[PDB]
Amino acid sequence: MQTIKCVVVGDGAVGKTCLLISYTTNKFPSEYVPTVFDNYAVTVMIGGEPYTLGLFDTAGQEDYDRLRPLSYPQTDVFLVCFSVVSPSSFENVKEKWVPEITHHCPKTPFLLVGTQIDLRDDPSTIEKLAKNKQKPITPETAEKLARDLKAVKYVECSALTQKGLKNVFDEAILAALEPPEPKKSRRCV
Amino acid sequence: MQTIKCVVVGDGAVGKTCLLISYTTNKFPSEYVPTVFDNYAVTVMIGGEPYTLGLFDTAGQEDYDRLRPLSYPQTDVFLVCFSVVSPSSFENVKEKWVPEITHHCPKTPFLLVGTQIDLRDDPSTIEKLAKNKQKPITPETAEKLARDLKAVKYVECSALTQKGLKNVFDEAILAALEEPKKSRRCV
Ligand SMILES: Nc1nc2c(ncn2[C@@H]2O[C@H](COP(=O)(O)OP(=O)(O)O)[C@@H](O)[C@@H]2O)c(=O)[nH]1
Ligand SMILES: Nc1nc2c(ncn2[C@@H]2O[C@H](COP(=O)(O)OP(=O)(O)O)[C@@H](O)[C@H]2O)c(=O)[nH]1
Numbered sequence A: 001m002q003t004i005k006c007v008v009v010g011d012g013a014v015g016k017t018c019l020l021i022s023y024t025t026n027k028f029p030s031e032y033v034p035t036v037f038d039n040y041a042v043t044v045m046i047g048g049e050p051y052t053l054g055l056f057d058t059a060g061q062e063d064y065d066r067l068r069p070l071s072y073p074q075t076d077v078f079l080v081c082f083s084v085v086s087p088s089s090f091e092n093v094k095e096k097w098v099p100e101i102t103h104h105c106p107k108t109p110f111l112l113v114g115t116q117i118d119l120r121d122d123p124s125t126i127e128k129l130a131k132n133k134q135k136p137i138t139p140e141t142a143e144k145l146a147r148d149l150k151a152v153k154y155v156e157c158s159a160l161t162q163k164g165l166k167n168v169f170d171e172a173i174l175a176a177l178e179p180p181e182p183k184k185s186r187r188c189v
Numbered sequence B: 001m002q003t004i005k006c007v008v009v010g011d012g013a014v015g016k017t018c019l020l021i022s023y024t025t026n027k028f029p030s031e032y033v034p035t036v037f038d039n040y041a042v043t044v045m046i047g048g049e050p051y052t053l054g055l056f057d058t059a060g061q062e063d064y065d066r067l068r069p070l071s072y073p074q075t076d077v078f079l080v081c082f083s084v085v086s087p088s089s090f091e092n093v094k095e096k097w098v099p100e101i102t103h104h105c106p107k108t109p110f111l112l113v114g115t116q117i118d119l120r121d122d123p124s125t126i127e128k129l130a131k132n133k134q135k136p137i138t139p140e141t142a143e144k145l146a147r148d149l150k151a152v153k154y155v156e157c158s159a160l161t162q163k164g165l166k167n168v169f170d171e172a173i174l175a176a177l178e179e180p181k182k183s184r185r186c187v
């Protein structure tokens, strides 16, 4: 009916699934994260006419490297997710994710989404980080990464406390608004 | 999950493509052989943890000279191949290959690989060599060059009889085992 496909991507355990399910049901899956890689839909009211926002989840694990890209076709905006309290995923945004996306979808915009920020203050997570890199990604450093990789922008959220969250998706909606007739329509293919 | 990139280089017709295909499939391409712009990813088991061995082929032809190096980055070890029954390929190892490789990848180890050894007796090949060539590169001779050009070592094989072949890659595996002090990764 006038679609907006947004494919979520990011290392594993980064909180991709919880982020979507949280956004869509307004309830963080506090007992079992649905093990199914599913699409989601939300009828957004952009302007005056409704738009179908297609939220697509992905399987991050390496095993899916050769398959994952299959869902990429016709995407409008991407969300490269990384857990604010696991530098691991953050490094991968650069070394793995952004490249993959660009490779397959060169004209498709993408936002850098920091996830699990609520944990930026959970001591045990900090005490665990101890391994010298006992430092959770800060907005300061993530932002530059956005600039370098050319992300439309950096937005961060907590699927647990709902903080930001919706914003991430508004930013996703606004970044995806393809032009009118223009042969320059970033819709991936 | 933990790789070892191995790029094969050598003069055309040296038996590069069959060397790979035969090693990976266990059967010499008896009726078809591509040009290769392909990649083979055998799951090697080093230690206790699996390693993905990336076998990359290259188009040796002069035309590809400025482009072929595009695959060089991320390489752990090199295989400079030359067909034992074609001195031409041999000379090119020193004059062409090692340098090219050296310049591009100054820290990446490489191995001197003699190919098509089984031909070192096919009369026709021999009698054709008659034109100033009573000798197909002997291991001893190649070995010498190995020392000179500082290759990790000289290994030879016959993609046809698969003789030695497997060894070539083991040596390739052992040569590429990057300690964490200095990574010979071609940048
Ligand atoms: N007899 C023999 N010839 C070989 C062997 N491996 C390759 N060849 C010969 O190689 C020719 C082409 O070599 P190829 O592998 O296509 O050379 P490349 O382009 O250097 O990879 C084939 O037509 C031959 O059968 C081998 O071990 N034994
Ligand atoms: N505390 C906290 N845990 C989160 C948050 N978002 C995700 N998780 C957790 O992250 C882990 C994996 O998240 P999932 O959504 O399953 O990650 P995926 O691999 O990216 O789909 C689980 O422990 C979730 O309980 C968040 O904002 N807060």
Ligand SMILES: [Mg+2]
Pocket: A016, A017, A058, A059
């Ligand atoms: Mg998931």
Ligand SMILES: [Mg+2]
Pocket: B013, B016, B017, B034, B035, B036, B058, B059
């Ligand atoms: Mg070839």
